């Protein structure tokens, strides 16, 4: 065939899209216990009946959790048993032979899902597929109990029967490709934006103010994000696995939490800084020295380390359930699992306490601007819009993740993994936004031009 280019058309990548890969036992749309790539364990409502059938199939005590390797072997067995089921049947084999490669997979898909016996019950639709009446079979199949239970999956399989191509599955890979370049643009923006801020402050003797000393720290935290955290996370998602062993998996995870903490806590420190800088400028200038500020920065990074490298390297963050035990053992797994204790304690430090202070402080600013020595004019609206961007961008990017992070702790299975990762990535892009928020000063503006000779 000479084909090693992506998206070869077959039943394996087709079902992987319809079924998905889930290592721990779950319930399908009907309520039956399924595991791996669409493997029906049992129809018994008991979870212990499910586990007993699973242990019998795998050959060991699994505790409801199998490995990737075990999941794939179950997959191929289930596919081969579907193909063997088709060739053994008297209604499936005549139709199966007379189908093309693409429409053979569409049949296997149905058999794989609702069994050999069930599929052979489609007398009319099989009669149409045999006589090559694809569009009638397509209309007809859409009138079944199968179409009402899993419509999204049925439409794809029906479309595969009608068109005879992989159109309904072809697009799925394009979106992975589009995803990959966007990640690149994120990394680029975070790196370029923050390397600029740090250079501007280090090089120009005039951006050497206390507030900028906090900006530098925020810019440093965002810098390590786009260099270490964001790219490695991108590769982890794109390649579906982790190829740097267990040590760098928890080292990377440590850098993740470290920089997110140091970033948000600095945003908090900046808000407080600007409160005193604005409300009481004479006390602010005399009390807050550059040495005192460099101590504040150290402490923010120390707290950050305490909530990142310390619990993680000492494995205190670790969960105890079987799926977490297996992933910790697997050199190619780096999924994130924590206990209630850590996920709550880290969230309060990394996000919630900074959030509260920032909401409080920025309120005290707006509220104290009303009670100064003073028409409802222009300058106040533009100022209110500024903190609306300052506080709005922070909230919109990090709040949805840390809420969901908590909800996943309270009630398990409530948040699908895809969402938890997307919302985490919406938090990552805040590192790109910050240089557009905290560096609009006329001094930054001038420095930015001279640095790149515009």
């Amino acid at each position, epitope marked *: 065939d000479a084909e090693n280019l992506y998206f070869q058309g077959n039943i394996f990548e087709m079902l992987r899209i319809d079924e998905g890969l889930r290592l721990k036992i779950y319930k399908d749309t009907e309520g039956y216990y399924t595991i791996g790539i669409g493997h029906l364990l049992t129809k018994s409502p008991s979870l212990n009946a499910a586990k007993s059938e699973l242990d019998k199939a795998i050959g060991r005590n699994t505790n409801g959790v199998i490995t990737k390797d075990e999941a794939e072997k179950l997959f191929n067995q289930d596919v081969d048993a579907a193909v063997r089921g088709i060739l053994r049947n008297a209604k499936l084999k005549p139709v199966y032979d007379s189908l093309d490669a693409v429409r053979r997979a569409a049949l296997i898909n149905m058999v794989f899902q609702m069994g050999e016996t069930g599929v052979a019950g489609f007398t009319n639709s099989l009669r149409m597929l045999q006589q090559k009446r694809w569009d009638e079979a397509a209309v007809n199949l859409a009138k079944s109990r199968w179409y009402n239970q899993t419509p999204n999956r049925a439409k794809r399989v029906i479309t595969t029967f009608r068109t005879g191509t992989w159109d309904a599955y072809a697009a799925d890979e394009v979106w992975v490709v589009g995803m990959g370049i966007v990640m690149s643009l994120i990394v680029l923006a975070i790196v370029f934006g923050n390397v600029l801020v740090i250079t501007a402050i280090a090089k120009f003797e005039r951006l050497q103010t206390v*507030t900028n000393y906090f900006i530098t720290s925020l810019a440093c935290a965002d810098l390590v994000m786009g260099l270490a955290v964001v790219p490695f996370g991108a590769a982890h998602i794109l390649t579906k696995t982790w190829t740097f062993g267990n040590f760098w998996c928890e080292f990377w995870t440590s850098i993740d939490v470290l920089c997110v903490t140091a970033s948000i806590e600095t945003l908090c420190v*900046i808000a407080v800084d*600007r409160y005193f800088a*604005i*409300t*009481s*400028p*004479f006390k602010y200038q005399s009390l807050l020295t550059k040495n005192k500020a460099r101590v504040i920065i150290l402490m923010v990074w120390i707290v950050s380390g305490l909530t990142s490298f310390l619990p993680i390297q000492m494995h205190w963050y670790r969960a105890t359930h079987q799926e977490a035990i297996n992933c910790y053992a697997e050199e190619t797994c780096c999924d994130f699992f924590t206990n209630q204790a850590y996920a709550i304690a880290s969230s309060i430090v990394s996000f919630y306490v900074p959030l509260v202070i920032m909401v409080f402080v920025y309120s005290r*600013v707006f509220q*104290e*601007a*009303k009670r*100064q*020595l*003073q028409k409802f*004019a*222009l*300058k*106040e609206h*533009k*100022a209110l819009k*500024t*903190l609306g961007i*300052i506080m709005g961008t922070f909230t919109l990017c990090w709040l949805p993740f840390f809420i969901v992070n908590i909800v996943h702790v309270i009630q398990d299975n409530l948040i699908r993994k895809e969402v938890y990762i997307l919302l985490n990535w919406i938090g990552y892009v805040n590192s790109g936004f910050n240089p557009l*928020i*905290y560096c*609009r*000063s*006329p*001094d*930054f503006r001038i420095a930015f031009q001279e640095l790149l000779c515009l």
Partner: nanobody
Amino acid sequence: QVQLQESGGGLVQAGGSLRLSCAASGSIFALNIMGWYRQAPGKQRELVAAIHSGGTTNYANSVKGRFTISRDNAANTVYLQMNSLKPEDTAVYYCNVKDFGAIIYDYDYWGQGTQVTVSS
């Protein structure tokens, strides 16, 4: 796009009194620092007296006890009282406003400048 009108300067005898005055024409943020800076002959620009929108003040260590800054009700006008004038107070006095519209940084508005000459 606001303006700063300065007035009050001129010639004055040693030990004489003088009253600078600056009015801010335009819309300035409710939180700001309105004050005066000066450039002595052949010396750098130095803060003289400043006043926060919240009332509090600040002075250079060479004008404390002699110079006093105050402001108006809502007209945003600032008056600088300069008593016991010395020859080292001979300079160019600029009226300044630090507007905190952006929160993160501060926007400076300057005055045109007014000369003050003390007869040594």
